[PDB]
Structures are given as structure tokens and as C-alpha cells.
Amino acid sequence: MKLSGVELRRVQMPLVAPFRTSFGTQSVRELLLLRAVTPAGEGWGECVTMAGPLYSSEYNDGAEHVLRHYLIPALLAAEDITAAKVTPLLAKFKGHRMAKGALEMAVLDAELRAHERSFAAELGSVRDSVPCGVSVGIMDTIPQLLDVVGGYLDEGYVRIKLKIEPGWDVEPVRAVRERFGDDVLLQVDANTAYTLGDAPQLARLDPFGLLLIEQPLEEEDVLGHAELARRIQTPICLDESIVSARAAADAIKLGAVQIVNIKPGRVGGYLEARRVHDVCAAHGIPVWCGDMGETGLGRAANVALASLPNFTLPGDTSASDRYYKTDITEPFVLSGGHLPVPTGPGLGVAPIPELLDEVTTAKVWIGS
Amino acid sequence: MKLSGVELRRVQMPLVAPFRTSFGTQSVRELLLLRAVTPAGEGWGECVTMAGPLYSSEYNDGAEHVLRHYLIPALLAAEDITAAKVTPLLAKFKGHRMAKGALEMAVLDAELRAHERSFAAELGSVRDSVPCGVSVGIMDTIPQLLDVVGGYLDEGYVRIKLKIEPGWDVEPVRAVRERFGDDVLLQVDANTAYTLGDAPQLARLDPFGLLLIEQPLEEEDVLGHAELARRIQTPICLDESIVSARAAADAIKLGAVQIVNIKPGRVGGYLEARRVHDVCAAHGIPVWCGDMGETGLGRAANVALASLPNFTLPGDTSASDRYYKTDITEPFVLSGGHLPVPTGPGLGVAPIPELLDEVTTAKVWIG
Ligand SMILES: CC(=O)N[C@@H](Cc1ccc2ccccc2c1)C(=O)O
Ligand SMILES: CC(=O)N[C@@H](Cc1ccc2ccccc2c1)C(=O)O
Ligand SMILES: [Mg+2]
Ligand SMILES: [Mg+2]
């Protein structure tokens, strides 16, 4: 098929409750959507960049720019396009993975819609539904955290992940363990906020039986993580560092990681995410599905991905209402702690135009 | 000191001759300059991004953007500023090293100009001049390459580096060795164009006594390089992979590298570059100064950097007229194969306003 053009939307969606992370607080989610147009029909992609370069180097304005001036033109110029061929067509351009991933997603949704095939089917789903956990931010006070956690447990979420940062690590975990007991699946995530010198402090988490600690150190410090794993008992999970299947293989060979968070956007797409899944599986490394506050479009693709065989831990693909009062698609609703895998062609969901329009702040067409 | 504001310039300078690399051909250099203004006075920084993200992920429009909307504001908002404090003030922002490095350069030039101290002095120079090599692009034909190389040798350049790429590796090297002999300092640079599966082809370079092969594989594939080093005799040098002092330490511990190319911009600044120099030195790893076609401003800072003790191989800091008929500063002129280290305060050079203006395509003030 030949790409006719792509529409770039900016979109802005308020969060039910502000969400605090070691790199800041977020009240509203600003994001990029893409509508790829082909002779056959349309498909949708979502970019997981944030407003500024605080989680990784990519951010909304920068992704929009590289998409407009480099990535989309290079696809418009090709005689034939496949989702798979996206990667080699964009290979000359270094990095910009979240951007490439978004564009691949859109192309893929189009391709698959035209073959009446689901994201699940293409990726290799073996399950109709997936158990879901929830990620809980940093709070101002312990009792406030305990209320939020108890709330998410009552809704039937299967696992709790706490954001952490120097100043907020051992106490919150101790408190959650004293209140809710030792049988709750419990894990933490630093989003890079520690250094190796903080090892004794992270070792203080040893006694609380956490599943894992996620990205304690900076993105590039793979060897540091392997050192850290020799000094603590909590298993290391990597997120930011895992930018590709190769990077996963490398981190595993070096003993830097025992469990991997897959975020499709972070690795340059759903197809590379499948590869990460398979590489980890070949080494005995469990994976789970990460989340970047996606709309229902990305959430639908993530739920499909999380239904692959080696996703053996609950993911962060929480229900739509954990982030948004009003999703721009048919919302995802937790049911017995699980989310159901979409069945339609492509994503198996699409934006409801009235809701999308409420929430769109800009729109531009990139054609021939 | 309190940063008053920064001026961003986009400039455009034609190259004496087009320059071909494994990621493409370039006829004109578009670049970003920064003029940092303080109560004390001014300083200059240069960004080494290119027009598009072909060498790394950063490019001119993208750097300008992250500078304008993130990096410069975060410095303007600080009570007190030092070159050293730039790093922690900008640490919340991930990556954008070439951009940060350009900004740090400008702040540093200002700070040092105010203390009447040279870049050389601040960085730890031990030499007044530095031996200079030259980088030669991919050519359409072998005889055309041989003419260009013979030319640079007549001008007295001390070492030759050839750009390489699948299709253009063993033949160009063989030809240069047959024509100019075994005593010429000779090396190659792939700018990431091979994979580990190309090992037998790179092993084909074994017999030609190259000083090194630079960045045969992709930026992130450090372990791959260590594997490659076990299968070839040419020493591995890394460039694109060496984004920081830590990354240099990591690559060295893994045996992925025996010689390191320092590009200040690529590592986030002249200060981090000094750290890369010192880390490599502590591990017995020689370094040499890389080049991104800088103007005389960046060239002046680089020559100063290259005068540090562990720069023991000739760098790519070639003379101004290797790239530009007309530099925007007092030009650098090769003399007995060397370039002299600037002596004035800061960079020791500044743009000649009439020259800069002819070549400026845009200009904006951030205050
Ligand atoms: C899912 C999780 O806890 N965090 C993501 C980071 C992240 C990034 C952007 C977000 C935007 C809106 C809401 C949550 C967000 C979470 C991660 O695991 O690092
Ligand atoms: C110095 C060298 O041979 N190459 C640089 C890449 C490079 C990049 C951009 C350039 C722009 C104009 C002229 C030369 C350029 C060289 C390097 O080592 O990777
Ligand atoms: Mg995470
Ligand atoms: Mg190089």
C-alpha cells in the first residue's frame, strides 16, 4: 500500500488526579496522535512523549518536528509500505524511537484493518484477557498514600507499584506492608532517581518482599545496575534502559536485569516490542507491559501486547478511568482485575470523533 | 554571575570541497552559534549538531528548540551561574548533549574572559602546539582519493584518516598504502556503517597496519565492539558510543575500546571532555581530539583541549582552510604539521563581525 498522508493532532486530557513521579508532577497529559491515511483506509498511532524531556530525551514538540520534517516524508516517498518496512525506511535517522513507534503504530493499524486482523492476532496473543496492576504516585503524606492504595485494591487491581525517590522509599513500603499485609503483589519504581552510592538505602527494602525495583539508576548505566544487583535482594527490573531488543540482550548478558518492562513506544514500536518479548523469553526473563498514560488507542494495543505468553507478571495497563474521566475511545473497564483483549480489526477501537474534537488543541495535515 | 540572556544564530558556511561520510554527502555546513551575555561580558559557544539526525539523534532545529524552550530558561532562572553549575542546573533534562555542550561553552568563555584566563589554562594545557591530522571523505574513484591524500600530505598533515563504508574500505586502504608507503600514520572511520557480521571484511584490513578503526558498529552496541576486537587486529576506537566519562569507563571495562575520540559537544561539553580525558588516562587509554567541522570558535577550544597530556595521537583538528575559504575568526594555519594553542582570555578568538554577518541566516535573542 501507498501512504497518502498523515494527520498530526495535539491533544490534551486532564487526569482524574495529579500523578507524581521522581521527575515531577503531572496534572494534564499532552500527547500526539497520528491518523495515517491510505487508499485502503485509515489507522491510528499514539506517541508516548511527554511535554518536556524529563523521562527520556524525546518530548512532544520534538517528536512532532521530527515526524513532520523527516519521518513522515520518508514514508510518503516510498513506492511500497508495510509496517515492517517502516523500520528500514526510517533507519538512516538516529533515535527518535517514541516518534518512530507512533508512526509504525498508525501504519500497522491501517494494514491490519485492511486484512480484518486484530493487533492481538498479529502479535501472537494466547489469552482473551490480562491481569492488571496499578501504578501509584509519590504522595505528600503516608496516610494519603495508604488511602489511594486501599482504593485501588478495592477496585480489584491485582498488584501495586509505588513510585519512589530519595526521601520516599522505605517508609511508604513499610507502611503499605503494615497496613495491607505480605500477600499483596508489591513493587517500586524510581524512574532513575538513585545512584550506586544509594545501595545501602535500597538494601533497606530487602525485608519487604518486593517483586522488583524498576530502573533505580540512570538510563545508560547498565553495568551499574549489575553492580547494584549484587548488593540488594530485590530483583532489578529495567524500563528506561531497554531501548531495543539488542539492549535487552546486552543487559541480560551483563546480569543487569532479571525482569523487563516493555513499553512499545520506548523501543520504537509494537513490532520491536514483540522482539523484546521474544528475546527475553529465550533467556528466561519475564516481561510485563508498561504504561505511559496512553489514551484508549495505545491502551488497546498495549492490552493486546500484554496477552503474549511471556507477559507473566501483571502490567501497568490500568483501566481508562484510572487516568481519565472520559477516554476518547470506548473505555477499558476493569473486571475481576482483568482487561479484555480487543477483538475487532486493528486496534479494535477508534476515537469517538465528538470526544476527540473536545480535547484536540491542534491538527495539521502532512501530505505528498 | 547572572546570565542576562543568550543569542542564537543559525549560520551557513560553504565547504571548500564536498565531504562524504558513510551517512551522506555535505556541501555546506549549517550550524548554531550562541552568544551568552553577562554583566561582566560576552562569551561564544558552538553547537556541533548537523542539519538532520544522521550522525546522532540531535540536529540543528532540535537543538535550537531545546535550547530556547528548556536549557536557556533554566540558566536564566538561576541566582548564580558557573560553567560547572551548568550541568546540575540542566540535569533534569535528558540527553541533548550537543546542545548542553554548546551552552556550557558559551558560559565558560564568558567566565574565563572575566578572569583573563585561557581555555588552555582552565583545561590543563601542557603544550603550546598540537600535531594535526586530516580526515578524508569517501571519493567516487581511487585515483581521486590518492590525489586528495597526497595533497594533504604535501601541506604537512601528520596523519591520514579515511572515511569508510561497505564498498569502500579495503581497496582505498590498499591503494593508499601502495602509493604512500607503510610509514604514514593511517586510520579509518566507519561512522557506524558495519555490523558484527561484517567482521571477516574488517579483518581484511589486518595486514595494512592501521592505527585504529573508528566506530565500526552502531552507537549502542558496545558489547558488539568487544566481540569485534577479538576477531580483528586493528585496534578499536570509539566516537559515537562515547557519550560521557561513565560511558568511556564502561566501554573500557568491557574491552570494547583501546583508543578514544573525544568530541566535546558529543559528550555534553568541554568540562565533561576533560573528564573523559582523565578517565581514559587513568586506564592507559590514549585519546585524540575529534572534529565536527567547527568554525574557528570551536576549533580554538578544541586545539586547547588537544593540548592536554593524554592526547597522544594526532587529532582531526585540521586547519581552517581545510574546510572553509573564509573562517569567521582569525583562521588557524598549519605550521610544521601543528596548530598553535590560543593565548588570549577565553577561547582566545572571537568572531570578526563583518565575517560573521555575511554568513548568518537567522538570529534571535532569549532574555
Ligand atoms: C505507568 C507508570 O507508573 N509510569 C510510567 C511513567 C509515566 C509517564 C507519563 C505518565 C502520564 C500520565 C500518567 C502517568 C504517567 C506515567 C513508568 O512506568 O515510568
Ligand atoms: C572530522 C571527521 O572526519 N568526521 C567527523 C564527522 C563529521 C561531521 C560533520 C562534518 C561537517 C563538515 C565537515 C566534516 C564533518 C565531519 C567524525 O569524526 O565523525
Ligand atoms: Mg517505569
Ligand atoms: Mg568519527
Short mmCIF file of C-alpha atoms in Angstrom, two decimals, chain A residues 23 51-59 61-62 65-67 69-70 92-97 191-192 218-224 243-244 246 249-251 253-254, chain B residues 23 51-59 61-62 65-67 69-70 92-97 191-192 218-224 243-244 246 249-251 253-254:
data_model
loop_
_atom_site.label_atom_id
_atom_site.label_comp_id
_atom_site.label_asym_id
_atom_site.label_seq_id
_atom_site.Cartn_x
_atom_site.Cartn_y
_atom_site.Cartn_z
CA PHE A 23 10.91 13.59 37.65
CA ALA A 51 5.54 17.73 27.29
CA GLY A 52 9.26 18.01 28.20
CA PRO A 53 12.36 15.72 28.18
CA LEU A 54 12.15 14.60 31.77
CA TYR A 55 11.60 10.79 31.35
CA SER A 56 13.74 10.49 28.20
CA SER A 57 15.18 12.85 25.62
CA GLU A 58 12.10 12.91 23.45
CA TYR A 59 9.25 15.33 24.05
CA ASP A 61 7.30 19.38 20.24
CA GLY A 62 10.49 17.47 19.29
CA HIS A 65 9.10 18.16 14.50
CA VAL A 66 11.00 15.02 13.55
CA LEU A 67 7.76 13.40 12.34
CA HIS A 69 10.18 17.08 8.62
CA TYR A 70 11.89 13.66 8.47
CA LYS A 92 19.02 6.49 8.49
CA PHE A 93 17.51 8.68 11.27
CA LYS A 94 19.09 8.08 14.67
CA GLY A 95 16.97 7.64 17.69
CA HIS A 96 13.56 9.21 17.93
CA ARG A 97 12.16 5.93 18.90
CA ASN A 191 12.50 6.33 37.30
CA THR A 192 16.35 6.75 37.55
CA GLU A 218 20.13 6.24 35.11
CA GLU A 219 19.20 5.04 31.58
CA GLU A 220 22.75 4.41 30.35
CA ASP A 221 24.17 2.81 33.50
CA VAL A 222 23.63 -0.87 32.70
CA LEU A 223 26.83 -2.03 34.44
CA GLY A 224 25.83 -0.02 37.47
CA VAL A 243 15.50 0.82 24.24
CA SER A 244 15.65 -2.24 21.92
CA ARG A 246 19.53 -5.75 21.45
CA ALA A 249 20.01 -8.94 25.29
CA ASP A 250 23.00 -6.85 26.38
CA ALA A 251 21.51 -6.06 29.78
CA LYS A 253 24.15 -10.97 29.39
CA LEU A 254 25.62 -8.44 31.82
CA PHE B 23 25.77 8.70 6.41
CA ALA B 51 21.15 19.77 9.64
CA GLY B 52 19.49 16.38 10.19
CA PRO B 53 19.83 13.47 12.67
CA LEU B 54 22.16 11.32 10.60
CA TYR B 55 25.29 11.16 12.83
CA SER B 56 23.32 11.18 16.08
CA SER B 57 19.79 11.97 17.17
CA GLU B 58 20.41 15.67 17.67
CA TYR B 59 20.08 18.16 14.78
CA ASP B 61 16.40 22.74 14.58
CA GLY B 62 16.06 20.32 17.54
CA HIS B 65 14.34 24.21 20.14
CA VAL B 66 15.59 22.54 23.35
CA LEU B 67 17.97 25.45 23.97
CA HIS B 69 12.49 26.43 25.50
CA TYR B 70 14.32 24.46 28.17
CA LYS B 92 16.64 17.19 34.90
CA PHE B 93 16.64 17.32 31.08
CA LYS B 94 17.62 14.03 29.46
CA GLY B 95 20.15 13.92 26.69
CA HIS B 96 20.61 16.85 24.36
CA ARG B 97 24.27 16.71 24.99
CA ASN B 191 30.63 6.17 11.43
CA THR B 192 28.57 3.05 12.37
CA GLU B 218 26.29 1.27 15.95
CA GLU B 219 26.36 3.76 18.85
CA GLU B 220 24.67 1.45 21.41
CA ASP B 221 26.49 -1.74 20.55
CA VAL B 222 29.38 -1.62 22.99
CA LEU B 223 29.46 -5.38 23.61
CA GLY B 224 29.49 -5.87 19.85
CA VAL B 243 28.77 9.99 25.26
CA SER B 244 30.26 10.60 28.72
CA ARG B 246 30.99 6.97 32.53
CA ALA B 249 34.78 3.79 31.68
CA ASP B 250 32.10 1.19 30.85
CA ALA B 251 33.43 0.60 27.32
CA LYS B 253 35.99 -2.25 31.38
CA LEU B 254 34.18 -4.28 28.69
#
